């Protein structure tokens, strides 16, 4: 049994509900941009889930992603985002999984949230550029490319990306 299923059953058992969660996490998360300034406890906090527990679940989703089982990874990452939507790598891995599944519209949203949670990182913007390109084209690709560019240049950490953007622009 996966640790995720262990947690859900653990939570469900200690409630007066058969299933104390939304049925459709996809619909539940649509258009959602986590606001760090809203003084609300996360469901990780509410359900007393340790960060170590979420990490175990993250690896499970990550493992599924590496096995090209994107459907399974998407399921897992949505749960993680449900429990703690302020962890940027949860959204990023969710975005990547949707990207590989060619669910670009939702992949774009996840990338966008990752950007908000992780302002210094150019890569969420770059993958947004790729996806916007894949819609042929919303014309949001160039705007996202520039945002990646600003964050990519001047820093040695993001040089590989800086080279690519230069290579793109010609």
């Amino acid at each position: 049994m996966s640790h995720l299923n262990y947690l859900l059953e653990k939570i469900a058992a200690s409630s007066k509900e058969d299933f104390p969660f939304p049925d459709d996490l996809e619909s539940y998360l649509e258009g959602y941009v986590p606001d760090k300034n809203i003084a609300l406890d996360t469901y990780q906090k509410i359900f007393k889930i340790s960060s170590e527990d979420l990490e175990k679940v993250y690896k499970e989703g990550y493992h599924a992603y590496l096995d090209k089982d994107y459907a399974k990874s998407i399921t897992v990452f949505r749960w993680l985002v449900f429990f703690n939507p302020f962890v940027s790598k949860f959204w990023f891995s969710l975005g990547a999984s949707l990207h590989m599944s060619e669910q670009y519209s939702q992949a774009l949203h996840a990338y966008g949230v990752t950007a908000v949670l992780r302002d210094k990182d150019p890569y969420p913007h770059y993958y947004a550029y790729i996806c916007y390109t894949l819609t042929n084209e919303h014309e949001e690709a160039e705007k996202a490319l520039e945002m990646a560019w600003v964050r990519a240049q001047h820093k040695p950490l993001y040089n590989e990306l800086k080279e690519e953007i230069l290579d793109i622009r010609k």
């Binding site: 007066k16 509900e17 058969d18 539940y28 998360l29 959602y32 609300l40 906090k45 449900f82």
Partner: protein, 289 residues
């Protein structure tokens, strides 16, 4: 021991003595009509009648061949006449007894409810209104679990009476009911605490104010897909009046409810977050700056 005892062993609504008594009252030359008449006479509940008939058919030895044939026909007529009232109820017999043991209600009362609930389309609200007249709120949780257990059983059997797709929708609605119940449970505990607090500082609260009213306001606010601080504040003022400590108290109660009530109550993360913001904004507007 004997077959009658085996039927009755785990069944709290009938005894082996009563089953044998029915058996002994039926002669070898009894017609299907005679059999059925004796069954209704000695057994009141159709589900137990159906159970007794199963026993009579099974226990009847080779020497009484004619009787066995009559019993099989009689059981078939019974099943045809009562239908789901007999078979559907019988299939949740033991579940109804185990759950009724935790309530001040009869097992047959629960089976009647289950039949009514699953006998037609029902939304979350309709389920709530249904339970509200019949049960206390604390009992509703156990009752809701009984309903879920019964419907889960109905999914396995795939019976002819209620379609699979309907049970699925029914379970979804019942899950929504259980989410709604968490609010009533939350406010039933906390509202008297708020009232005692307000009374302790000499603040009078409206007599028409109770945890049910507060819970309905909470759900009214949650079901508002475009929440504003103004609308939230107005709803609270309509609820408890214009005293600043009273209004603040309810607002804090609503805000606390966002982490104490079921996540299923919210159809989107965005609105839950936005509602938290608006309650926070309402608190600021209300207090003296």
């Amino acid at each position: 021991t004997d077959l009658a005892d085996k039927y009755a062993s785990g069944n709290s609504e009938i005894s082996g003595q009563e089953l044998r008594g029915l058996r002994d009252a039926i002669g070898d030359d009894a017609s299907p009509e005679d059999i059925l008449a004796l069954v209704q006479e000695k057994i009141k509940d159709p589900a137990l009648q159906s159970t007794a008939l199963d026993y009579l058919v099974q226990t009847t030895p080779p020497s009484q061949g004619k009787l066995k044939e009559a019993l099989i026909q009689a059981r078939n007529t019974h099943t045809e006449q009562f239908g789901r009232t007999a078979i559907g109820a019988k299939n949740i017999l033991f579940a109804s007894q185990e759950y009724a043991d935790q309530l001040n209600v009869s097992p047959s009362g629960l089976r009647s409810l289950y039949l009514e609930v699953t006998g037609d389309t029902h939304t979350c609200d309709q389920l709530l209104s249904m339970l509200q007249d019949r049960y206390t709120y604390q009992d509703m949780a156990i009752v809701s679990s009984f309903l879920m257990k019964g419907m889960a059983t109905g999914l396995k059997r795939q019976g002819p009476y209620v379609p699979s797709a309907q049970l699925q929708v029914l379970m979804t609605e019942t899950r929504n009911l259980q989410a709604v119940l968490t609010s009533y449970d939350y406010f039933e505990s906390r509202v008297p605490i708020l009232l005692d607090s307000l009374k302790a500082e000499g603040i009078q609260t409206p007599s028409d104010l109770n945890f049910v009213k507060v819970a309905e306001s909470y759900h009214k606010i949650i079901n508002d897909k475009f929440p504003t601080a103004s609308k939230v504040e107005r709803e609270v003022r309509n609820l408890i009046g214009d005293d600043v400590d009273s209004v603040t108290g309810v607002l804090n109660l609503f805000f606390s409810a966002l982490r104490q009530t079921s996540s299923r109550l919210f159809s989107s993360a965005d609105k839950r977050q936005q509602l938290g913001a608006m309650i926070a904004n309402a608190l600021d507007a209300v207090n003296i700056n």
